[PDB]
Design a protein around this ligand. Sequence first.
Ligand SMILES: *[C@@H]1O[C@H](CO)[C@@H](O[C@@H]2O[C@H](CO)[C@@H](O[C@@H]3O[C@H](CO)[C@@H](O)[C@H](O)[C@@H]3O)[C@H](O)[C@H]2NC(C)=O)[C@H](O)[C@H]1NC(C)=O
Ligand SMILES: *[C@@H]1O[C@H](CO)[C@@H](O[C@@H]2O[C@H](CO)[C@@H](O[C@@H]3O[C@H](CO)[C@@H](O)[C@H](O)[C@@H]3O)[C@H](O)[C@H]2NC(C)=O)[C@H](O)[C@H]1NC(C)=O
Ligand SMILES: CCOC(=O)c1c(CSc2ccccc2)n(C)c2cc(Br)c(O)c(CN(C)C)c12
Ligand SMILES: CCOC(=O)c1c(CSc2ccccc2)n(C)c2cc(Br)c(O)c(CN(C)C)c12
Ligand SMILES: CCOC(=O)c1c(CSc2ccccc2)n(C)c2cc(Br)c(O)c(CN(C)C)c12
Ligand SMILES: *[C@@H]1O[C@H](CO)[C@@H](O[C@@H]2O[C@H](CO)[C@@H](O)[C@H](O)[C@H]2NC(C)=O)[C@H](O)[C@H]1NC(C)=O
Ligand SMILES: *[C@@H]1O[C@H](CO)[C@@H](O)[C@H](O)[C@H]1NC(C)=O
Ligand SMILES: *[C@@H]1O[C@H](CO)[C@@H](O)[C@H](O)[C@H]1NC(C)=O
Ligand SMILES: *[C@@H]1O[C@H](CO)[C@@H](O)[C@H](O)[C@H]1NC(C)=O
Ligand SMILES: *[C@@H]1O[C@H](CO)[C@@H](O)[C@H](O)[C@H]1NC(C)=O
Ligand SMILES: *[C@@H]1O[C@H](CO)[C@@H](O)[C@H](O)[C@H]1NC(C)=O
Ligand SMILES: *[C@@H]1O[C@H](CO)[C@@H](O)[C@H](O)[C@H]1NC(C)=O
Ligand SMILES: *[C@@H]1O[C@H](CO)[C@@H](O)[C@H](O)[C@H]1NC(C)=O
Ligand SMILES: *[C@@H]1O[C@H](CO)[C@@H](O)[C@H](O)[C@H]1NC(C)=O
Ligand SMILES: *[C@@H]1O[C@H](CO)[C@@H](O)[C@H](O)[C@H]1NC(C)=O
Lengths: 171, 171, 171, 316, 316, 316
Amino acid sequence: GLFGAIAGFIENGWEGLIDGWYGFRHQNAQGEGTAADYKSTQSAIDQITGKLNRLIEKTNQQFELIDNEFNEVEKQIGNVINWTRDSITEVWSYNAELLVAMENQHTIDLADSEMDKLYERVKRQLRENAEEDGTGCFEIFHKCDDDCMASIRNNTYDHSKYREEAMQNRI
Amino acid sequence: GLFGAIAGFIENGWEGLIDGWYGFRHQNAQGEGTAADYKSTQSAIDQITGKLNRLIEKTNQQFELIDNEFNEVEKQIGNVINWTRDSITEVWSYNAELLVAMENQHTIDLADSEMDKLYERVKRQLRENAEEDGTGCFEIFHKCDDDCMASIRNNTYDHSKYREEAMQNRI
Amino acid sequence: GLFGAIAGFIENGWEGLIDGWYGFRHQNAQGEGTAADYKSTQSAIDQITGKLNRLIEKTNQQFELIDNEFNEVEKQIGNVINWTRDSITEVWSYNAELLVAMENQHTIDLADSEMDKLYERVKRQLRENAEEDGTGCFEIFHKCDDDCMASIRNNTYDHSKYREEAMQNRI
Amino acid sequence: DKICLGHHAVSNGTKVNTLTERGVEVVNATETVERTNIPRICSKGKRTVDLGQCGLLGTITGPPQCDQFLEFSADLIIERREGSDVCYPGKFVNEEALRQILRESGGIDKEAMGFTYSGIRTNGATSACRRSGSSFYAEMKWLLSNTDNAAFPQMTKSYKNTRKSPALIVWGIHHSVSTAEQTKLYGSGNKLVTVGSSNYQQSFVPSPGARPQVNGLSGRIDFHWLMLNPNDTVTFSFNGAFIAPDRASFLRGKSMGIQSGVQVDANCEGDCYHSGGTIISNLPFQNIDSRAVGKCPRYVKQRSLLLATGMKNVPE
Amino acid sequence: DKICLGHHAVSNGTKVNTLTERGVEVVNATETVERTNIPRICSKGKRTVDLGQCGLLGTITGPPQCDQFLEFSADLIIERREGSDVCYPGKFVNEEALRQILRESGGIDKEAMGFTYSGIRTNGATSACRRSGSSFYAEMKWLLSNTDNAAFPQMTKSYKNTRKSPALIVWGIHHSVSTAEQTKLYGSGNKLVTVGSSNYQQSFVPSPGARPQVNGLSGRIDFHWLMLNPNDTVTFSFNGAFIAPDRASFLRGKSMGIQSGVQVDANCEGDCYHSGGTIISNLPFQNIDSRAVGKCPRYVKQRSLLLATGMKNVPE
Amino acid sequence: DKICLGHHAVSNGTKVNTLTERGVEVVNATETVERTNIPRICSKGKRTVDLGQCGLLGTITGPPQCDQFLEFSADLIIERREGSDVCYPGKFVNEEALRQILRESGGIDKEAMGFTYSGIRTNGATSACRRSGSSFYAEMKWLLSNTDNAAFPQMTKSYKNTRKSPALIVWGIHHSVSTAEQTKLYGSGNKLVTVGSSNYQQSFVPSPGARPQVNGLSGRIDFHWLMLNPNDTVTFSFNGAFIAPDRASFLRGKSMGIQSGVQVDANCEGDCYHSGGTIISNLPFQNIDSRAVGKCPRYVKQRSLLLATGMKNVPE
Ligand SMILES: *[C@@H]1O[C@H](CO)[C@@H](O[C@@H]2O[C@H](CO)[C@@H](O[C@@H]3O[C@H](CO)[C@@H](O)[C@H](O)[C@@H]3O)[C@H](O)[C@H]2NC(C)=O)[C@H](O)[C@H]1NC(C)=O
Ligand SMILES: *[C@@H]1O[C@H](CO)[C@@H](O[C@@H]2O[C@H](CO)[C@@H](O[C@@H]3O[C@H](CO)[C@@H](O)[C@H](O)[C@@H]3O)[C@H](O)[C@H]2NC(C)=O)[C@H](O)[C@H]1NC(C)=O
Ligand SMILES: CCOC(=O)c1c(CSc2ccccc2)n(C)c2cc(Br)c(O)c(CN(C)C)c12
Ligand SMILES: CCOC(=O)c1c(CSc2ccccc2)n(C)c2cc(Br)c(O)c(CN(C)C)c12
Ligand SMILES: CCOC(=O)c1c(CSc2ccccc2)n(C)c2cc(Br)c(O)c(CN(C)C)c12
Ligand SMILES: *[C@@H]1O[C@H](CO)[C@@H](O[C@@H]2O[C@H](CO)[C@@H](O)[C@H](O)[C@H]2NC(C)=O)[C@H](O)[C@H]1NC(C)=O
Ligand SMILES: *[C@@H]1O[C@H](CO)[C@@H](O)[C@H](O)[C@H]1NC(C)=O
Ligand SMILES: *[C@@H]1O[C@H](CO)[C@@H](O)[C@H](O)[C@H]1NC(C)=O
Ligand SMILES: *[C@@H]1O[C@H](CO)[C@@H](O)[C@H](O)[C@H]1NC(C)=O
Ligand SMILES: *[C@@H]1O[C@H](CO)[C@@H](O)[C@H](O)[C@H]1NC(C)=O
Ligand SMILES: *[C@@H]1O[C@H](CO)[C@@H](O)[C@H](O)[C@H]1NC(C)=O
Ligand SMILES: *[C@@H]1O[C@H](CO)[C@@H](O)[C@H](O)[C@H]1NC(C)=O
Ligand SMILES: *[C@@H]1O[C@H](CO)[C@@H](O)[C@H](O)[C@H]1NC(C)=O
Ligand SMILES: *[C@@H]1O[C@H](CO)[C@@H](O)[C@H](O)[C@H]1NC(C)=O
Ligand SMILES: *[C@@H]1O[C@H](CO)[C@@H](O)[C@H](O)[C@H]1NC(C)=O
């Protein structure tokens, strides 16, 4: 993707993440945990869903018969009709192919974007209390128990509360 | 947007910013100020304007009458004409709808992108002398008067001049 | 581009980089060096090549003669045929113009993105041992000989091995 | 202590195509091309007429197989391969134009044209149009001389359309097997039919001569037609070999016509038809029949185009 | 001390549509579909002919209503609903083809064909073609016998196109209301008109009979035409019922033709016309008339398609 | 110590267009629009027939220039500008429809219709159809009276299609230069040709008269044709002015026809043809000829559309 997270510095996805599109996996002395992030998941779902509803918008155009399946029309006008119909069919086959390909490129890139946005949100939450390891994880330079992890996940983590300890541990 | 600044970590826009698309709002002992950044504003304006000029490029094939509004043409050829014209109309309505949607998606993402480019530019100017608060602001860890702020806006801020003081203030 | 690397904070390209699309230019006590990065180059090349192979996908629709170049067909049916063909020609001229314009926009943005992904990769390799200067260079705060540079380029640089020295130089 | 950001995945994703790549796996995808056909004409909510053995053009002239449709009314008209416009051998001139007019007519409403005759027979009949005996087209009259080889009087018949929509006017030309038969029926000499309105003028001459027997008969009756504008008058001038109209037709409203070979189902409802059934779908494209009519998904040549609805799938 | 990066916004933005969303507010947008029509035919810079009561085909044959247009020259030709091609009732074969030929002709330039006659009258006239009295088509001659019921001599008249572009040749076949009129005008007996060139061969027999009265007359004239290649010859062989051409037409250059119901305005300049006026626009699409002609924005069914020209609007 | 990230560049790149900009310089680009023409008809693998001076319709009647093509077989049929359908002047009814039938026929297979004559001449010939002397159409017979001005006997000739595909039947109506010539060839009096099948019947009267000399002759032939269904019969009833068919045609299979002015090359292989040669290309668009036929790149009006294959070029 254009943002190099989903197929990039995040090496693969989590098949156990069944509760959302994006999420957090934490590690501390109390153990390991995995939870889904609602805001990013719903953001991506909302954009792809809006795209889908956009693509199935119905427009009422009626076309009638100009050919004859039982008694073939005159040769010259029949060849003109056949040429026109085949040209239009080619135009719409091209439009469908291009439309689906472009939409797919953009969908993949948009999901990549939402992943990167979640990662950056957490990075700005942690401020000077953590460092990126380069695989999508933040090494936290202070003890972060389950309540601390939960405060990161629901955006109530106060970096000042741990700053002096973490800064000292980074030097 | 794909870039997550506009309508992203920057929570809303400034209705008082009437002289540019992007800008700086500073706070120091002398008070608060708002000024526009010319380079990013002009970059976005140039790209959207180029898109606009591209979309109104005149390449005009001339078409003549093949129907008759006063004396209807023979029925069969008139039906073929009407079928062809309706098919072409549907194709061009589709082209217009898709084109405008895609161009609008890209325009929004491009403005988002230019905002992020300005943000990252300032971050790299400040180096080790400031920290991001996560809402589009840079907490500067030294006294920065109006001339200092102006040096940030016009890309003459020398981080070395304040480095040792600022990094000391960060402990 | 949307990612503001190429033609962005990287001021210009290297005409001496003849063995790849992206690369590293280092300087240390042993002198200056330039090397190409294989992964980013091959990633971009693979994506543009896939796009190209997509655009030359062959579809084998046959169209036959429906007018006459030597003995002109009847006037009215000839005018209809010419109108239909000119409409189809305008549709395909539009499709070609828009397709090439869109694909070119996306190609430029994709190369910009791969450049930015390489830059971010190196930044995360270097961790706390270097600082960005704002022009695409990383000021390294420890002695980094040719083997050290080579380890940065092939992703074997162990930041811990130099952290103590580097941190001691950054404060 | 550490916290890691990640995304979901599945073991087996769905391959889709993009601008740069074929067969990239994504977590989820959905089909845009419709392939499922309902092999019936779903006609709920539509006044539907299955013409069966009646050819659509016959509804204007009225051979026996069309007796039940002489003034039909419909929203959907179904033509069948066994439909015939004629009973006595012959054909319409400019038949496809008239079929296209009648497919969207909503049906026809007949009105007497008021032609009366004297000095001739009006009861021409044939064993090819059987209604409990030798008969003829219910809407036409085969004008003959009073007795064999008698002279057919020169005649002029006019009809004015007093209604607010154009009137469909039809007449016939009889082509005898020989000049002797034509003389036996209408008297000797050249035969001429002139037809005129304010925007129409055309002449018709019978073409007597030997031809193969169709159902045992070698004569023909070819039907011709015109649309008569309001306040406009049609005038026929003839001296024989003329199949006169008894009634004119007016179009009822709107409809659509299809040609099908599958049964009608008044228990499913649809709006897109082809000869093989009905296309019922919310998908924007279909790969079933490029000649479908109604309100239809756009026909494309691809059988499948998967649209990604999830991120790229990166399993472990 | 701190410094904050931000972007502009407005209190009331403009809603646009994207690939993923309908009605997202952006700071600014601009219309791409043209709806504003100028209810006049803007003809500045173009030599313009408003045919008015002259029908376009009449310019070739010359009924009175077309006397001022017998050799017209134009870049833009305007047909009106009240235009008539005829005075003596009749119609052209392949009329729409000829109309399309004349709309792009740039006008016509007439040249005498040099036919001289002996033993016949050439001043056939009718009060349906009034020029201070009974007259006829200005470019034609109604050939009659010298006296009532006299025999019409068999004649052959040839014309060679000596110019460098094809010559438009028009003739007529006259269908009298009755055998007595055809006899009075051309003498009794069979009538035949054959017309031939190097790429054209056709034959005509008159069909007398009553047709509805148009302009007081129940006879009709069939007008036929051909394009005579340079150095080629057209030959007419006739013995009556023949409306002869007096002059041939040559196309001047290039023009375009429209059908309108609004006045001409030589003070605005435009290149896209419909019956209701002129579309003057820089926008790429229009929702005014799907049958507009000239150099036009593309017709689309949508009345409005707003293009974003600013960032997303995020107010306070 | 520092390490810098960068990208490659060149001193002079190639300019392309994007959605927002014209002439942005990129490191590399490739053309999508084909402009290179091969000025020959590449026919490897295809049975090709170069008609040369033979007009395609002539293959049915057989003027001298078509003797080599009377039963041709081909996958690709090439018409040339010098092709002629006739020797004795004349022209076909619905000529272009028949050309389109023959372009896709794969060639024709002739079979004798079995007409024999007595009491007339059958060897009518002209110096306009020269085969070492005066001759005629190889597939027709110009039926004449036994001696000058002698009466041509009334006769009827029928042919039944005993094969499994429709038969192409062609006949002619001869129009002499004058009544005297028609009398000399077929005797005085009325002449009539009636043609009938199960779905076709038509009468023809020759129309003698002077026409311009084409190939030295002032008479003309009207060529008519029909498709005779299997087991159906075509019947000709005539007393003169009738060009009888000697053989019927059956379509061999399938082919396509082109019109070219360049030589054939059986050593190059192609699938897209125009009058100037063959388009052999992997590019998706072409700017050579909008009327190219076969399997072709799509014609576009642009002569060049450069697709970026590299990053933006920012030189030093
Ligand atoms: C994988 O993608 C498919 C395709 O989008 C997803 O199926 C979609 O699911 C939603 C809700 O589950 C459906 O919304 C529906 O809206 C209709 C409106 O008429 C309503 O009647 C239904 O009750 C429902 O709310 C949507 O139609 C449906 N789309 C298709 C094509 O079936 C599917 O959920 C995705 N899988 C996962 C795991 O997300
Ligand atoms: C909201 O968007 C519209 C549309 O882009 C803006 O109007 C545009 O303003 C520019 C400059 O003010 C106009 O550029 C013009 O270019 C032509 C070249 O032919 C030149 O002759 C003019 O002198 C001018 O330089 C542009 O035409 C105009 N567009 C339209 C459709 O009027 C508008 O300014 C935007 N609103 C705000 C508050 O920025
Ligand atoms: C998935 C394909 O659906 C479409 O092609 C259309 C679509 C959906 S494609 C699209 C997707 C996102 C944004 C804009 C368009 N829209 C909106 C149309 C609007 C009009 Br008007 C129109 O004529 C069509 C053509 N239809 C009738 C075949 C479409
Ligand atoms: C450069 C343009 O090439 C194409 O037009 C097509 C292309 C290539 S453009 C493209 C590129 C990426 C994704 C989708 C389309 N594809 C795949 C087509 C698929 C079908 Br089905 C099709 O009818 C066409 C139309 N061709 C036959 C004129 C194309
Ligand atoms: C907004 C729509 O305008 C256009 O359709 C076209 C436009 C503008 S849309 C566009 C924007 C960026 C890139 C390509 C097309 N261009 C450039 C065309 C180029 C050619 Br060649 C062409 O045939 C058309 C078709 N027009 C004449 C009906 C367009
Ligand atoms: C966000 O997470 C924090 C951390 O778990 C929540 O704060 C705790 O809430 C639980 C249950 O209400 C208490 O037992 C803890 O004592 C709380 N810890 C602190 C430091 O206050 C917080 O409630 C969560 N926010 C929301 C909206 O659910
Ligand atoms: C048009 O195409 C159909 C098949 O789609 C074919 O059967 C028919 O013969 C064609 N019409 C003509 C006039 O060739
Ligand atoms: C074609 O459509 C127009 C309306 O756009 C209609 O008025 C006209 O009657 C139609 N022509 C035929 C031959 O049905
Ligand atoms: C930037 O602002 C500072 C402070 O006023 C000034 O000294 C400097 O000259 C400015 N630079 C430019 C390029 O205007
Ligand atoms: C159609 O276009 C061709 C070439 O553009 C031209 O030679 C021909 O005359 C046109 N047909 C008619 C009927 O005008
Ligand atoms: C990376 O470079 C170092 C220094 O030259 C070398 O020792 C090491 O083997 C390299 N690693 C790989 C994977 O090539
Ligand atoms: C109505 O028809 C009559 C013919 O009987 C005609 O005289 C009259 O002008 C017509 N009315 C209109 C408004 O055309
Ligand atoms: C027509 O004839 C003249 C002389 O009679 C000759 O100069 C001219 O070239 C001819 N035109 C053509 C097209 O052959
Ligand atoms: C430029 O692109 C073309 C087409 O993709 C390719 O053949 C050529 O090798 C490329 N040039 C370079 C220097 O890679
Ligand atoms: C034609 O008739 C023959 C016998 O006369 C019969 O064998 C053949 O099957 C028939 N063909 C068709 C197509 O009906």
